[PDB]
C-alpha cells in the first residue's frame, strides 16, 4: 500500500515533515482530551440517551489510536539524510484512516439516530441502510485511493461511485432529521438542524482531500491533505460529538432527569 500512495514519491523538508507529525500527534491529543469529557458527562445523560455519549467515547479512542498509529508509522518510515527526510521503510499509508472511518462512521450515524428519538423497527432499518451505504462509500473510496499514483483516471471513477453512496446516505440522514425534529425536546429541534449542516461541511472535506493527488501531486499537496484530514476529523468527530452531547443532555433535562437538569444549572 505504501507504494500506492503519493506520500512515497517525495523527499520532505524538515518543516514539512515536522508539520505533518505535529498535526497527527495534536489530533491524538484532542481526541483523548475530549474522551475524558464525554466520559465525565455521561452521568448527566438520561438512560435513553446515554449510549450516544458512549458512542463518542468509542469514536474518540478509535480515531486517537489510528492517528497515533499514523504518527509512529510516519516517523518510522522516513529518516533525515543529507538535508531532507527520505523514505527508508514502506510502513506508511492513509489506508488505515479508511479502516478508522469503517468503524467510526457506524458509531457517528447511530448516535444521531438515537438523539432523533427513533426506536424499534425504524431505528434498526434506518441504521442498516445508512451503514450499508456508508461502508459502500468507504470501500469504493479505499479501492480508489490505491490508484492515486498509478491510475488517476481509475481513482476518479471509484470516487464517482463512492460519491453516489455518499449522496444517497446524506438523503436518508437529511430526510430523517427533518421529519423527526418535531419529536425533539428542550428546543433541540433547532439544534439538530445545525448538526446536519456541520455534517455536510465536515464530511465534504474528505472527498476534497481525496482528490489532492489530481490537483496537487507534490510534497506541499501531501501537507495540505493531512491538514484537510485534520480539520475534517476534528469537525466530523469532536465538534459533532459535542453537539450530540448537548442535545443528549438538554433532552434529558427536559425529560425529567435530575442530573441533566442540575448539571446545566
Ligand atoms: C454492476 C454495477 C452495480 C452498480 C449498482 C451499485 C450502485 C447503487 C447505488 C445506490 C443504491 C441505492 C438504492 C436505493 C435504496 C435506498 C434504500 C432507502 O431508501 O432507505 C432509506 C429510507 O429512508 C429508510 O427506510
Ligand atoms: C458522481 C456525482 C453524481 C452526481 C451527484 C449530483 C447529486 C447531488 C445532489 C444532492 C446531494 C445530496 C444532498 C442531500 C441533502 C439532504 C436532502 C434532504 O434532507 O431532503 C430534504 C427533505 O426532502 C425535506 O423534507
Ligand atoms: C486541546 C483541548 C481541546 C479540548 C477538546 C474539547 C473538550 C470539550 C471542552 C469544552 C466543552 C464545551 C462544549 C460543551 C457542550 C455542552 C455540554 C453541556 O451540555 O454542559 C454540560 C456541563 O459541562 C456539565 O456540567
Ligand atoms: C471521520 C468521520 C467521517 C464521517 C469520515 C467520513 C468520510 C467521508 C464522508 C469520505 C467520503 C469519500 C467520498 C464521498 C468519495 C471519495 C472517497 C471518500 C471516501 C473520501
Ligand atoms: C486529562 C487527560 C488528558 C490527556 C491528553 C492527552 C494525553 C496523551 C499523551 C500524549 C499525547 C500524544 C502522544 C503520542 C506520541
Ligand atoms: C449487516 C449490517 C447491519 C448492521 C446492524 C446494526 C444496526 C444497529 C441498530 C441499533 C442498535 C440499538 C443501539 C442502542 C439502542 C439504545 C438502547 C438504550 O438506550 O439503552
Ligand atoms: C461498481 C463500481 C464499478 C467500478 C469499476 C471501475 C473499473 C476500474 C478497472 O478495474 O479497470
Ligand atoms: C469525487 C467525485 C468524482 C468526480 C469525477 C469526475 C468525472 C471524471 C472527469 C474527467 C476525467 C478526466 C480524464 C483524464 C484522464 C487522466 C489520465 C492522467 O493523465 O493521469
DSSP string, 88-150: -SS---THHHHHHHHHHHHHHHHHHHHHTT--HHHHHHHHHHHHHHHHHHHHHHHHHHTTTTT
Residue of the nearest CA to atom 10 in ligand 1? 165
Residue of the nearest CA to atom 3 in ligand 3? 30
Residue 86's DSSP bridge partners are 79
The resolution in angstroms reads 1.9
Alpha carbons 128 and 120: distance in angstroms, whole number: 13
Looking up cell 451503514 gives 131
Q: How many CA atoms lie within 13 A of 158 on its CB side?
A: 19
Which candidate, 245, 239, 219, places its Cα nearest to that of 7? 219
Q: What share of the chain is helix, strand, coil (3-state, %, to 5)?
A: 80, 5, 15
Q: How far apart are the first and last CA of the chain?
A: 52
Which numbered ligand comes closest to the C-alpha of 233?
4
Stretch (H or E) spanning 29: helix 14-41
- For the CA of 154, the closest atom of ligand 7 is 8
The CA distances from residue 231 to 7, 45, 66, 153, 206, in Å, are 19, 28, 16, 27, 10
The CA distances from residue 237 to 4, 60, 64, 199, 244, in Å, are 27, 8, 11, 10, 10
User: CB 163: neighbour CB atoms within 10 A?
Assistant: 15
Alpha carbons 264 and 24: distance in angstroms, whole number: 33
The CB of 254 under 6 Å from ligand 6? The reply is no
How would you classify residue 79: left for phi > 0, otherwise alpha for psi between -120 and 50, otherwise beta? beta
Which residues approach ligand 3 with their CB closer than 6 A?
Answer: 29-30, 33-34, 37, 41, 44, 242, 245-246, 249, 263-264
Looking up cell 497527527 gives 24
Stretch (H or E) spanning 86: strand 84-87
Longest dimension (CA), the chain: 66
Q: What grid cell was written down for 186?
A: 428542550
Looking up cell 434506518 gives 126
User: CB 96: neighbour CB atoms within 10 A?
Assistant: 17
The CA distances from residue 82 to 15, 72, 197, in Å, are 15, 22, 47
CA dihedral over 223, 227, 233, 236, signed as positive or negative: negative
Structure obtained using: X-ray
Q: How many CA atoms lie within 13 A of 245 on its CB side?
A: 23
- Three-state DSSP at 6 gives helix
- List phi, psi (to 5°) of 84: -145, 160
Alpha carbons 137 and 99: distance in angstroms, whole number: 12
Amino acid at each position: 500500500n505504501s507504494m500506492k500512495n503519493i506520500e512515497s514519491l517525495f523527499d520532505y523538508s524538515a518543516g514539512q515533515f515536522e508539520f505533518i507529525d505535529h498535526l497527527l500527534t495534536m489530533g491524538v491529543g484532542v481526541h483523548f482530551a475530549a474522551l475524558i469529557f464525554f466520559l465525565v458527562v455521561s452521568q448527566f445523560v438520561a438512560p435513553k440517551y446515554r449510549i450516544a455519549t458512549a458512542l463518542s467515547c468509542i469514536v474518540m479512542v478509535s480515531a486517537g489510536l489510528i492517528l497515533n498509529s499514523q504518527a509512529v508509522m510516519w516517523t518510522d518510515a522516513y529518516a533525515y539524510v543529507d538535508g531532507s527526510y527520505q523514505l527508508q521503510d514502506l510502513t506508511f499509508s492513509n489506508g488505515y484512516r479508511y479502516v478508522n472511518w469503517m468503524a467510526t462512521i457506524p458509531c457517528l450515524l447511530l448516535q444521531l439516530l438515537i438523539v432523533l428519538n427513533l426506536k424499534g423497527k425504524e431505528l434498526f432499518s434506518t441504521a442498516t441502510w445508512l451503514i450499508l451505504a456508508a461502508w459502500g462509500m468507504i470501500i469504493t473510496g479505499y479501492v480508489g485511493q490505491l490508484y492515486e499514483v498509478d491510475d488517476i483516471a481509475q481513482l476518479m471513477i471509484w470516487g464517482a461511485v463512492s460519491t453516489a453512496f455518499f449522496v444517497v446516505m446524506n438523503w436518508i440522514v437529511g430526510t430523517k432529521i427533518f421529519k423527526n425534529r418535531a419529536t425533539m425536546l428542550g428546543g433541540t429541534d433547532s439544534t439538530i438542524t445545525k448538526v446536519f449542516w456541520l455534517m455536510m461541511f465536515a464530511w465534504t472535506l474528505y472527498p476534497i482531500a481525496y482528490l489532492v493527488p489530481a490537483f496537487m501531486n507534490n510534497a506541499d499537496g501531501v501537507v495540505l491533505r493531512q491538514l484537510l484530514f485534520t480539520i475534517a476529523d476534528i469537525s466530523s468527530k469532536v465538534i459533532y460529538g459535542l453537539m450530540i452531547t448537548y442535545i443528549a443532555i438538554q433532552q434529558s433535562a427536559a425529560a425529567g432527569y435530575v442530573p441533566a437538569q442540575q448539571a446545566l444549572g
